[PDB]
Amino acid sequence: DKKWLGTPIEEMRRMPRCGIRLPLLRPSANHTVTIRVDLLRAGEVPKPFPTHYKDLWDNKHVKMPCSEQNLYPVAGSRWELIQTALLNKFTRPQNLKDAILKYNVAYSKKWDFTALIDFWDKVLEEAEAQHLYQSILPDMVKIALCLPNICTQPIPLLAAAMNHSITMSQEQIASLLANAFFCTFPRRNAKMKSEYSSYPDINFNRLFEGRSSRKPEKLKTLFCYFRRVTAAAPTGLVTFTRQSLEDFPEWERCEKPLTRLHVTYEGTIEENGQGMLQVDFANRFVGGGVTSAGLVQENIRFLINPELIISRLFTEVLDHNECLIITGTEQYSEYTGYAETYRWSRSHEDGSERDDWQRRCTEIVAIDALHFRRYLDQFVPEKMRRELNKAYCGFLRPGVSSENLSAVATGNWGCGAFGGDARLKALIQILAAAAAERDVVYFTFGDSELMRDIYSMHIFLTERKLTVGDVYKLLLRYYNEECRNCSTPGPDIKLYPFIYHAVESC
């Protein structure tokens, strides 16, 4: 054999059709909106609000490159220097390197551009290089330099413990990402910062370093985006929401029953999870190595939907009780392979419907698992509860009734780069989803035996009417009986065999 098991996928809930009616979009104390809501119309470019640039340069907002406070000790205006640097014609990759370093002189002997030079000179055909330097690069300069007329409203930092949303236009995101490419964001570079030390990288300089054979594929993927958004302005909106919860379940006491499961070894979250809450297997610094050498699940998703990358501008490192929810990002590329075999394949025409706020009906949640370096570490109760609460915060929507919640589209979260056990993490996600009253659609990414094993456990537990609490207590017993007093790397028997025996024996 079977390709999928459990509840047919046609029976699972999907957006927009399962959705609450959206309230009117408006700015408020916990929702920043950077466009004119009164003028938002389908197929029209949104108008920035306010009409003229307003600057804040403080510890609660993004420091914009176009700020009059963005100065260089010669005090000269760094925005003026940026403009003079980028409005030269490029015909050779050294021209672009020298331009970026004019306003980054402190890094002129630290940043490496080898991958940019190789991409331009040694990967691209002559016609492709000419298209890059005659069309794509100068169009990117012009949208970057229009920043003060496009991003007129200060952008607040989504700082630790904030429950806050920012809704901005795709056009505004494109201007900001072109600045990131040209490495213009101030105060976001020094390795010995206090300021932004708790925020991810945003400037793209690590994309230009070294000789990995995957750098040209990352660059192709990004230039597909940049070519598209500079050739024709995108018309929709994107919302970024930080969610930080205070109250978590007492898991042992939870009387909720398990919800429905569809599990399959074919397909992916991004192709087969249309209208479902899509999980991003995050680093606590959202996007992880997307701007450097990373190229597994999250990093690939951030390349093919590049509007995700701008979350790194304003999103502080996630604490154990937090997630980031992004609604409306558009898919611009397709890919083949994975990690060391990843290739850009072609431009993607996103056919997702838009909602009443002109957002693509695509909802992604970044939740970072723990990175385990010893197998048995993950069965410690404190660490199981940490994973349960993280997944719960990712899945829960306070205020929303369960019949208006789509299924979760997820898979082997924390079980590749982060070293977790997929049979344990799958059960953890099933318990968290049950506590949030959502069904689960689980992609095992080619592993047919894991598909069979998750299905078998789920239907065993469901047919015996075990609650979330009953299951969580079984996990505590596995730790006590097989892990705590263990003094070899691996326990004597595996989680699922333990569970079947414990239940069938009683």
From Swiss-Prot:
EC number(s) on file: 3.2.1.143
Q: Any idea which positions bind substrate?
A: 269-270, 283, 297, 338, 412-417
Q: Name one GO biological process term.
A: ATP generation from poly-ADP-D-ribose
Give the signal peptide as a residue range, or say none if absent.
none
Q: Name one GO cellular component term.
A: nuclear body
- On whether Phosphoprotein is a keyword of this UniProt record, the answer is yes
Q: Which GO terms describe its molecular function?
A: poly(ADP-ribose) glycohydrolase activity
The UniProt keyword set, sorted, is: Acetylation, Cytoplasm, DNA damage, Hydrolase, Mitochondrion, Nucleus, Phosphoprotein
Q: Which residues form the active site?
A: 280, 298, 299
* Catalysed reactions, as listed in the record: [(1''->2')-ADP-alpha-D-ribose](n) + H2O = [(1''->2')-ADP-alpha-D-ribose](n-1) + ADP-D-ribose
Presence of the UniProt keyword Disulfide bond in the record: no
Instruction: Give the source's domain of life in one word.
Output: Eukaryota
- Tissues expressing this chain: Ubiquitously expressed.
- Where do the segments described as Catalytic lie? 153-338
Subunit structure, interactors included? Interacts with PCNA. Interacts with NUDT5.
Protein function: Poly(ADP-ribose) glycohydrolase that degrades poly(ADP-ribose) by hydrolyzing the ribose-ribose bonds present in poly(ADP-ribose). PARG acts both as an endo- and exoglycosidase, releasing poly(ADP-ribose) of different length as well as ADP-ribose monomers. It is however unable to cleave the ester bond between the terminal ADP-ribose and ADP-ribosylated residues, leaving proteins that are mono-ADP-ribosylated. Poly(ADP-ribose) is synthesized after DNA damage is only present transiently and is rapidly degraded by PARG.
Entry remark concerning the domains of this protein: The PIP-box mediates interaction with PCNA and localization to replication foci.
In the record, the note on similarity to other proteins reads:
Belongs to the poly(ADP-ribose) glycohydrolase family.
| Name of the protein described by the UniProt record | Poly(ADP-ribose) glycohydrolase
Species of origin: Homo sapiens
Name the gene that codes for it: PARG
